[PDB]
Structure 1
Amino acid sequence: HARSTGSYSLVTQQPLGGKAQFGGQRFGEMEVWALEAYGAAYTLQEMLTVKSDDVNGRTKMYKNIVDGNHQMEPGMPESFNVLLKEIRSLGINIELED
């Protein structure tokens, strides 16, 4: 089931529920905990942000790797923006301070 880049989901999680449909394996909550237990904050951050749902992040990472500079443009997961919109739609203002 190997995959590099493919079509993305509604929430913009790129792997699109992997099956016949070309997909990436769910780096679930247990694996996130496992990376947290390690001193991992760069591989975890990249694979929970620039590898999964950050559209600008994903495009920049692809252009960077094909350029040869493996540099992460962090940005922000679009899943968090989806969560903010869903909580706001309930009628609960959740926003960020600059």
Structure 2
Amino acid sequence: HARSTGSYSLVTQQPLGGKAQFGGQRFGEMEVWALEAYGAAYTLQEMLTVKSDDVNGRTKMYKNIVDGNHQMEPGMPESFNVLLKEIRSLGINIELEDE
């Protein structure tokens, strides 16, 4: 199996795999430690931002790849952005501070 860019799930903007290019590889907690044990800070960020949950960066990436600029403009994963609204839709006020 392989997959560059494919389909994505509605609730969690994460790679789901139906028709055409299949589902992506799961990159679990233990694989994350590997990158942490290396210095792979960027390899990790792009692995859990632009390459998966970042609904905006993922296409700012695909456009930048074909443009010939190997940059990522990150942004925030949807998993955490949903957790804002999930915590916030309990009685809990959770904010992002400073500047």
Considering the TM-score relative to the shorter chain, is it more than 0.5? Answer: yes
How far apart, in 2, do the equivalents of 1:66 and 1:2 lie? 19
Q: With structure 1 as the length reference, what TM-score do the two structures score?
A: 0.88
Structure 1 outlier segments of 4+, above 6 Å: 17-21
Conservation of the 8 A alpha-carbon contact between 1:11 and 1:82: no
Q: CA deviation at 1:14?
A: 2.8
Q: CA deviation at 1:18?
A: 8.1
Report the count of equivalent residues.
98
Conservation of the 8 A alpha-carbon contact between 2:7 and 2:17: no
Task: Flag the structure with higher helix content.
Answer: 1
Which 5+ residue runs of structure 1 have no aligned equivalent? none
Task: Flag the structure with higher strand content.
Answer: 2
Q: With structure 2 as the length reference, what TM-score do the two structures score?
A: 0.87
Q: Pick closer, same or farther for the CA change 1:96–1:51 going to 2, 3 Å.
A: same
Q: Counterpart of 1:10 in 2: which secondary structure?
A: coil
Which 5+ residue runs of structure 2 have no aligned equivalent? none
Q: CA deviation at 1:8?
A: 0.8
Q: CA deviation at 1:53?
A: 1.3
- Which is worse superposed, 18-27 or 55-64? 18-27
- Higher RCO (C-alpha under 8 Å, 6+ residues apart): 1
How far apart, in 2, do the equivalents of 1:37 and 1:13 lie? 28
**Alignment identity in percent?**
100
